[PDB]
UniProtKB/Swiss-Prot annotation:
Effect of residue 269 to S: In CDAN3B; loss of function in erythropoiesis as it does not rescue multinucleation and cytokinesis defects in RACGAP1-deficient erythroid and Hela cells; increased GAP activity towards RHOA; no effect on GAP activity towards RAC1 and CDC42
Name of the protein in its database record: Rac GTPase-activating protein 1
Record-annotated site: Arginine finger: 222
Disease note: Anemia, congenital dyserythropoietic, 3B, autosomal recessive: An autosomal recessive blood disorder characterized by marked dyserythropoiesis, hemolytic anemia, macrocytosis in the peripheral blood, and giant multinucleated erythroblasts in the bone marrow.
Domain (Rho-GAP) ranges: 186-376
Glycyl lysine isopeptide (Lys-Gly) (interchain with G-Cter in SUMO2) crosslink residues: 241
Span of the signal peptide: none
Taxonomic source organism: Homo sapiens (Human)
Compartments, record wording: Nucleus; Cytoplasm; Cytoplasm, Cytoskeleton, Spindle; Cytoplasmic vesicle, Secretory vesicle, Acrosome
Record's function text: Component of the centralspindlin complex that serves as a microtubule-dependent and Rho-mediated signaling required for the myosin contractile ring formation during the cell cycle cytokinesis. Required for proper attachment of the midbody to the cell membrane during cytokinesis. Sequentially binds to ECT2 and RAB11FIP3 which regulates cleavage furrow ingression and abscission during cytokinesis. Plays key roles in controlling cell growth and differentiation of hematopoietic cells through mechanisms other than regulating Rac GTPase activity. Has a critical role in erythropoiesis.
PTM note: Phosphorylated at multiple sites in the midbody during cytokinesis. Phosphorylation on multiple serine residues by PLK1 enhances its association with ECT2 and is critical for cleavage furrow formation.
Entry's free-text remark on domains: The coiled coil region is indispensible for localization to the midbody during cytokinesis.
Residues of the full protein shown: 348 to 545 of 632
Tissue occurrence: Highly expressed in testis, thymus and placenta. Expressed at lower levels in spleen and peripheral blood lymphocytes. In testis, expression is restricted to germ cells with the highest levels of expression found in spermatocytes. Expression is regulated in a cell cycle-dependent manner and peaks during G2/M phase.
């Protein structure tokens, strides 16, 4: 019988985690632009005379899944912690976000630091784009240095697109696994404007900034900004009370992350605890006409502040989906916003409940985003 090992992959959204797992397990490079929520794969590998069956646990890199991701950590044998060579920001998040999370939930589990998209290091288009932000591709020595800094078992670079170095990543992860076991915010109402349309200033400002500087950017809302930058912006907002000067933030993705963070951390979700189940049930109705009618009914039950803020957000997200540059259609946006605006029916649900809710959240957002622009616009009085 083969030796079984559990491998969990983590890292910033869109840094290449799924493509790496699929190229290795299926020998085929996925061409679609779709964010992962949670998926499981199986791959075989022969290492040091042993046949090993690797269970590959794919996860979402978005901050929106910070509360749900830990459900994947129990019994992990090795972690693949990734960043992309064409994204210095994704490397910055390795010691700032990923290492603290993994060491908390997976103490003593070996970590392989992986630099993805190696094929882009000398890509001129990539270099020109990074230069606009005064950046450049990550250098090999930087990856190795970071690996030593975080106590990783090793560092490996690869390109799922060219297949270069892919098996080596899993060979090292498998050896690490074998060696390690050898011999062993208040309520929304407190932030909104005085009357209809009742929306928080931070939401209006973020949306306006994003529509001004982000509709031509690939992966809006899928790509998170530097964890530190978002934390600083959030800290200032809640302390100074006024919205920070967003025009001074060079990375528009950080503004997207700020908006999602604000919404996700409200005392209760945008759709409220009281209607959480009603929304999920309405979206789960098989018959489209009946589902749509049930969703209109649920929206009509929301408090004014929640309805107006939701309407403003839906109009904005429809524009994001309609842009030919973002590659973020309704289905993609629903996957990212599910935990952020739907969330759960209680403050601290148990793991069983958290898991049960996962599949139900995106459906709610997809249904809401599919409601007519004319419908949402009435609440904006335009
Ligand atoms: N150039 C290049 N692009 C890649 C590579 N791997 C993934 N990508 C692209 O990066 C984007 C996100 O990939 P994906 O694996 O879905 O990201 P994930 O959110 O970490 O699972 C997609 O456009 C992929 O085609 C790579 O090795 N080289
Ligand atoms: Mg993925």
């Amino acid at each position: 019988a083969a030796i079984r090992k559990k491998l969990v992959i983590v890292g910033d959204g869109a840094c290449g985690k799924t493509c790496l797992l699929i190229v290795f397990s299926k020998d085929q490079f996925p061409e679609v632009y779709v964010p992962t929520v949670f998926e499981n794969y199986v791959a075989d590998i022969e290492v040091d005379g042993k046949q090993v069956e690797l269970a590959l646990w794919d996860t979402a890199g978005q901050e929106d899944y910070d509360r749900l991701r830990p459900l994947s950590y129990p019994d992990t044998d090795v972690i693949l912690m990734c960043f992309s060579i064409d994204s210095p920001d994704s490397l910055e998040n390795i010691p700032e976000k990923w290492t603290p999370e993994v060491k908390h939930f997976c103490p003593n589990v070996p970590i392989i630091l992986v630099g993805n998209k190696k094929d882009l290091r000398n890509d001129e288009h990539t270099r020109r784009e990074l230069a606009k932000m005064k950046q450049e591709p990550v250098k090999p020595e930087e990856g190795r240095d970071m690996a030593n800094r975080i106590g990783a078992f090793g560092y490996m670079e690869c390109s799922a697109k060219t297949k270069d170095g892919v098996r080596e990543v899993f060979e090292m992860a498998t050896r690490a696994a074998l060696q390690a076991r050898r011999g062993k915010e208040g309520m929304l109402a407190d932030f909104v404007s005085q009357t209809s349309p009742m929306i928080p200033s931070i939401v209006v400002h973020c949306v306006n900034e994003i529509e001004q500087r982000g509709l031509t950017e690939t992966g809006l809302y899928r790509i998170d900004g530097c964890d530190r930058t978002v934390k600083e912006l959030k800290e200032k907002f809640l302390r100074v009370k006024t919205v920070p000067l967003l025009s001074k933030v060079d990375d528009i993705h950080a503004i997207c992350s700020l908006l999602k963070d604000f919404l996700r951390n409200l005392k209760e979700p945008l759709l409220t605890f009281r209607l959480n189940r009603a929304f999920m049930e309405a979206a789960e109705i098989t018959d489209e006409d009946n589902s749509i009618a049930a969703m209109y009914q649920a929206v009509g039950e929301l408090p004014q502040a929640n309805r107006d803020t939701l309407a403003f957000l839906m109009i904005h997200l429809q524009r994001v989906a309609q842009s030919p540059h973002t590659k973020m259609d309704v289905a993609n946006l629903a996957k990212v916003f599910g935990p952020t605006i739907v969330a759960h029916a209680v403050p601290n649900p148990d793991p069983v409940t958290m898991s049960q809710d996962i599949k139900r959240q995106p459906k709610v957002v997809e249904r809401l985003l599919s409601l007519p622009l004319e419908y949402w616009s009435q609440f904006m009085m335009v």
